Point group: C5
Chain length 334, copies 5
């Protein structure tokens, strides 16, 4: 029996190696397999990875006439001591178990141990959509011991920045992923003490040109089209009025569609500001012709009893104001 | 063996400490980690937290030459007595178990015990949307013993208002969170008796300006635009009619979009009242020109065989009525 | 040991109390905690409640110098006999298990037993939407023994109509709940025999005014607006034609939006009938002016080589027909 | 002890009754309780039913002074032999377990056994939507032994067509259910051999009138309305042009709404063909007036330097072509 | 007892057959039952299949007077050694367990073993939608040993390309499936070594004509309709202006609907390019008439104090440019 070579019943495996003395160091390596999904409304992401641990335990040393190691499955875990790692700020996770539990244990003749498992985790990530669609987001995954303070267990990256590997075909449907790196920091709990915590960081970005073409282009085109009325004869009322009222209707339908396609985030964003400023511009264009028509009718009635100056001034004033607004807007939001 | 220092087999752990005598006090502390989501249609919220208990049991005292404590995992729970807490008015919950069960047990040499676990819970919360989007909501989470009356188990906050801690980056996508505090109250069951119950309370609010700009602005702009027709010559029927009919169409499309974006709550809200009053105003504007045109045609036919008074009165009457309505509406709903 | 006071190993708990003789009566009480959700497409509802049982078993009597009872958790259930209740016509259910199983057992010194558990269940409910939104629905939850006929187990409400309690803040987002009561009836299975079955009944209703304002109002307003054209001069073709064609477009957009907001039920309802009758009315209004214009052009051409009678008759005929239709419709559907 | 009357430890229950000899027959009966849901996109359905088995095993015979049978729960299943049935072409299933496992076992004194359980299953069903909404679908549920060939286990319906029962109130929200019946057929696996397979069949249909009124009616009405322009004076260009352009807009909005309400199936259906033919008809109507106006302007200019024949021919040609198309279409698709 | 014929307790089943010597070969066969679903947003697919293994183990040989084999259920798996296969790049999987675990074991008298199970798996698949809807996708499923390198376990297809079978009625709602085949490749892990990996490949395609008719047809028809204005008299301003403004509105509504029906992929696709080029064409058509009207008004005013050349040139220039664009576009994207 392979389990009789290790004196399982001759040791108490309820206690850590080296109990009573200096803390036992544990090394960690991580391989990211894929990103599964992201949720903007719930502000969280899902990931699948391999987790590996390294430490030494003299109690597991066995005699040998060569240098071959023994491999075990997950059934041996319950008979020995292993680190109790958990993910911080996580919402749900589980360990794969098809066709059997995805757990492996390797023991060297001198007592070195390797412990590996395959897991999926969902973690929180606070997001800010003030500068949408030009916004940038940063995420992290956290690992910590649940019951062991730094005085008993010392947690670190096995090989520094080289302990993190990522799959070559990791990608997201609506985001670009960049700048993976790792960090460490100490955490304090008033109940027990200080703990070591490991981090994995990365950054997310959007495709700008797609959003530009979908949103900014039609509004600008509609604003430019609203200016055509300034060059039509003021005596053609049945041409002048329905032009403006149909332009307002088109702008309203565009805004409603754009709202219907965006993530349901209930606070002001930059695109909304741009759209509503364009709406206000379209509205003022109709007000202008209203004034011009009333003034012309009053003058004709008074005379009874050429280009109007308002149109001549508007032809210059409206484009200049729109250009100034664009310049300020793109200086603020880059 | 660490478990041989505690006389597990020398005691009956089916019975509470102090059985037959005064009730055993139990203290509680809670740390909120994050809010996960909220559902307005189902009226419930989800939360993740740490739960901690404190009590004393002489049966667990062990001799020691120092003052060091022993730490245990979840496997020891089934061999001893622990409080049976549960969440009241909850829909679902579970305990995290990756990479192993998130449970810890600490025993002092004098028999003091600390019991901590990490859990996610979904709880009900009745909501009222009468004053939407200006409404405010209050929520609470409840904790109670399942089988032990106050005569056997006394439940309380360990440190009063200081027993509650919240994460510094707790936030919701579409809500603002404020005013966390704790309370206690007694509950009565006719089957068994009286029980102690603990509460955790907080308040929710919306972003007003976003809803204002999305909903109230376009309706007001359309109502103001409908008034332009009063200043156009009454002899331009092909300009007067299509203006009004297109304004009605635009208002209808706006209302349909606004309905399509709101949570599916099937009873009257304030925003609906505002929108339909604006719709009625637009409708009356078309009726006005209908009357004016019929009267003018009748007068011309009678004569055959200047500004009309109706327009002159409407130019003043319509804005005043709209202002009065706004004043009453914003006095009622603040 | 508390379990040594009951002679567990001295009895066979695979057989019911009183085996071989008259059936053992069992009493039931239910407390409804909340309604969780409802699904109109799948026609089912979800509920959370406490379930309690009462019976007597002499085998569990224990000697005592006082009149105190013993309390047990769910671990004792597997060592004794308990009733095997199940929910009929249910889709899914489960028992809460945080922080431990929500089960309690109380034994009196004379052998009386109380057995309580907390459960969530989803049950079917056939619905008929013919009279939507004026429809009414009735639901029920059913409880029955799985393996025991009335000759072995007699099931009844412990205290008649007083065995049912409901929470004071039970509510649904889109429904009103009323008229809770209980009933019993016998059921027959050809495989085994007759069984007792318990019922819990309640009724559901909608908010009428919300649906009225959302649906019936705009259609009526559009039908009334379509009548304006009868009072405009027949010589203004460019005003008469686009009015009607835009009214048809507005009505079509309204119908499409109303369809987009309703539950996806694929058979005819009353609201659809009302909407399509209004659509037909709008369509006939355009046909009327088409005829009037053709007749006027023919007469002018013949003469070449005042109010038309059709308009004068239509002004009276259309409103009367619409009023008659409304009267019949609201007499049929109340 | 009831389990001591059956010599459990005196027999090997790892082997089928009659091992080494002729195959043991097993009879099956099924009672359908309800249909839970259907998914057109994923093409599958869900069902809840009772499953019952019948066979004889001499090893379970026990002496008795009467003819009473013994009833067992699911805990005895693991101690004896039972058939290993499974559902073929299924996606997921489970056995109900509230308040305990829904399993029953009945043993006669001569060794006859009845084995019943309550289960929910989701199964695949390939669907074809070519003739939607006039299409018809056929479904089936399949049952088979997992490890036993016909040489060891013979599976059949206990009572032929009478072994299938259905609930009197089984219904689906958007479908009609009819023609339940059962069949059997042999299946071959190259790995092991031949197996018996049982079938349960039924048929599904839609409500035709609802779809007719929702889809076909508005398109026909719009096509008929487009013909009005043929009877208006050709000199009223501002009435003729906007009529046609608004009719095209209305038709486009109707088609978009109809697409938005239908199941997301990405291949051509009959309703789409009808809608796009109507669209083409509307488009040709505008082209006609374009030609008429250009020809009239050319003739007036040439003369400078009555009803047009095109309108007279169109008034007859368009309705005849539409009627012919309808006749062919409804002859093809019935 | 059947398990006493195999000397279970006389062997250590924690170690592979042939331990210490050459690697043990294992053969694999797969039968695909159905495809369950696909997700374009999450880029993954689901499948159900049977998995079978073949190998030889002398430790399981038993004496026999004939050549009959013994069949076992899943309860024997835990008492012997079996290969630890797992799926690479998978998101979730599970083994069916109704009415019991779907596992079978067959042992020949000489020690040959067959091991079969039924499983459902969801796997990742990176997709590229640049050429949508004309795009093509390739997918694969991967199988590998979790703890055994090629030096200990040799994995291969049992019968080459004949080891893969597919159901005759496998289909997807919105895709066509073709070209199933298998491949093998070696993989390297720096932690342990080299591993054998098996592949299953297939290809996906769309229905082109459906997308053509739904998307490309209406845009082309609207572009062609916008050209009608070039043939109308330039003196009919109230006919010329609203035509163009309504054509722009119709095009915008079409684009919004098309966007509302497509999978939410946030980057540029070919269909978007086609739609926005058509939009630009419609916009230029309105600009043309604006210029023509201004020039005519200026000339009339100057004279005060026939066909215009712009229309004559446009009638030829616009269709030629559109044809050239179509030719280039369909040469690029085939
Ligand atoms: C252990 C270690 O070297 N960590 C570094 C980290 O401090 C640095 O920020 C990153 C590049 O930004 O590269 C890595
Ligand atoms: C135990 C205790 O001091 N509780 C108080 C509570 O009564 C009070 O309402 C709250 C502030 O409102 O502060 C805390
Ligand atoms: C046990 C009993 O009294 N049940 C009654 C029931 O028969 C009656 O229908 C209901 C009121 O409708 O009140 C309760
Ligand atoms: C066992 C048996 O009698 N089966 C028949 C089946 O063959 C027949 O098709 C059906 C009616 O169609 O009635 C049943
Ligand atoms: C083991 C074997 O013969 N595999 C082949 C594979 O190499 C080839 O690509 C495919 C057809 O393309 O047919 C199969
Ligand atoms: C809530 C933070 C300030 C947001 C400012 C938005 C201003 C937009 C006004 C648009 C007017 C048309
Ligand atoms: C149901 C509680 C009273 C709601 C009152 C709403 C009144 C709105 C009328 C709108 C008329 C256009
Ligand atoms: C299917 C049961 C009869 C439904 C009758 C509906 C009649 C509505 C006709 C509407 C015509 C515009
Ligand atoms: C893909 C199978 C043939 C489908 C034929 C559809 C023809 C519809 C043409 C509609 C033209 C407006
Ligand atoms: C992002 C890769 C290049 C995409 C090029 C799209 C060009 C489309 C322009 C449409 C102008 C109306
Ligand atoms: C904001 C004013 C709305 C009414 C303006 C009507 C036009 C006035 C022209 C003098
Ligand atoms: C008619 C004079 C020129 C009109 C266009 C002016 C554009 C000004 C942009 C700064
Ligand atoms: C509510 C009345 C609808 C018909 C009114 C038509 C206009 C009348 C002008 C005198
Ligand atoms: C249902 C008839 C459709 C064509 C009617 C065109 C108007 C005719 C006026 C005499
Ligand atoms: C012009 C005569 C009165 C027009 C309105 C008549 C309404 C009739 C409703 C019964
Ligand atoms: C003006 C002559 C009759 C117009 C309608 C003809 C309908 C033909 C349908 C076959
Ligand atoms: C398909 C042709 C589109 C341009 C036609 C413009 C009308 C021509 C009238 C002679
Ligand atoms: C000369 C006609 C000018 C028409 C107005 C153009 C304003 C927008 C220019 C892009
Ligand atoms: C009026 C001269 C012909 C107009 C149509 C020309 C089409 C050119 C396509 C290359
Ligand atoms: O309850 C606790 N007191 O400290 C810790 C926990 C859980 C997470 N590890 C540190
Ligand atoms: O069934 C009961 N009778 O009292 C209680 C319960 C459950 C919740 N604790 C108090
Ligand atoms: O299979 C059965 N034969 O009778 C019954 C069942 C289940 C539900 N209880 C009565
Ligand atoms: O793997 C198999 N070889 O034959 C069968 C199976 C499963 C389903 N029963 C027949
Ligand atoms: O952790 C590992 N080191 O090598 C492997 C694993 C898992 C998958 N098998 C090969
Ligand atoms: C009218 C558009 C101006 C854009 C300027 C952008 C400056 C970075
Ligand atoms: C016309 C808007 C009036 C708003 C008044 C608000 C008073 C608090
Ligand atoms: C025109 C509406 C008539 C409503 C009558 C209602 C009778 C109960
Ligand atoms: C114009 C509709 C004709 C319908 C004919 C139907 C023949 C079965
Ligand atoms: C105007 C459409 C031209 C299509 C050409 C296609 C060449 C393969
Ligand atoms: C829209 C503003 C017009 C101002 C006329 C004096
Ligand atoms: C805003 C334009 C004013 C023009 C004054 C003549
Ligand atoms: C819309 C009301 C008009 C009243 C004319 C007297
Ligand atoms: C409602 C306006 C009435 C005007 C009377 C002259
Ligand atoms: C819409 C019907 C008109 C009838 C003219 C005689
Ligand atoms: C339907 C109206 C007919 C009028 C006859 C003069
Ligand atoms: C729409 C086709 C018109 C043909 C004129 C000759
Ligand atoms: C398609 C109609 C042609 C008419 C010829 C005079
Ligand atoms: C739309 C471009 C018009 C150019 C006139 C010179
Ligand atoms: C783009 C058309 C230009 C025409 C020049 C006469
Ligand atoms: Cl006009």
């Amino acid at each position: 029996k392979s389990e009789q070579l290790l004196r399982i019943d001759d040791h108490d495996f309820s206690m850590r190696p080296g109990f009573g003395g200096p803390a036992i160091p544990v090394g960690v390596d991580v391989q990211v397999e894929s990103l599964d999904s992201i949720s903007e409304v719930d502000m969280d992401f899902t990931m699948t990875l391999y987790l590996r641990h390294y430490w030494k335990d003299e109690r597991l040393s066995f005699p040998s006439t060569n240098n071959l190691s023994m491999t075990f499955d997950g059934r041996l875990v319950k008979k020995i001591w292993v680190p109790d790692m958990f993910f911080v700020h996580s919402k749900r996770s589980f360990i794969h178990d098809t066709t059997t539990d995805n757990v492996m244990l390797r023991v060297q003749p001198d007592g070195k141990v390797l412990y590996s498992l395959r897991v999926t985790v969902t973690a929180m990530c606070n997001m800010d959509f003030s500068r949408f669609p030009l916004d940038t987001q940063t995420c992290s995954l956290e690992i910590e011991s649940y019951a062991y303070t730094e005085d008993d267990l010392m947690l670190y990256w096995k090989k520094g920045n080289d302990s993190l590997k990522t799959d070559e075909r990791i990608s997201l449907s609506q985001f670009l992923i960049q700048e993976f790196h790792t960090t460490t920091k100490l955490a304090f709990y008033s109940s027990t003490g200080w703990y070591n915590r490991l981090y994995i960081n990365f950054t997310l970005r959007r495709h700008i040109f797609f959003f530009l073409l979908q949103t900014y282009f039609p509004a600008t085109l509609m604003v430019m089209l609203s200016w055509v009325s300034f060059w039509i004869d003021r005596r053609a009322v049945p041409a002048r009025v329905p032009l403006g009222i149909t332009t307002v209707l088109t702008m309203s339908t565009i805004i409603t569609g754009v709202n219907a396609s965006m993530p349901r985030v209930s606070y002001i964003k930059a695109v909304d500001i741009y759209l509503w400023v364009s709406f206000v511009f379209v509205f003022l264009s109709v007000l202008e012709y209203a004034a011009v028509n009333y003034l012309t009718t009053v003058q004709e009635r008074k005379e009874q009893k050429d280009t109007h100056a308002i149109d001549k001034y508007s032809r210059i004033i409206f484009p200049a104001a729109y250009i100034l607004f664009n310049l300020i807007y793109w200086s603020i939001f880059s």
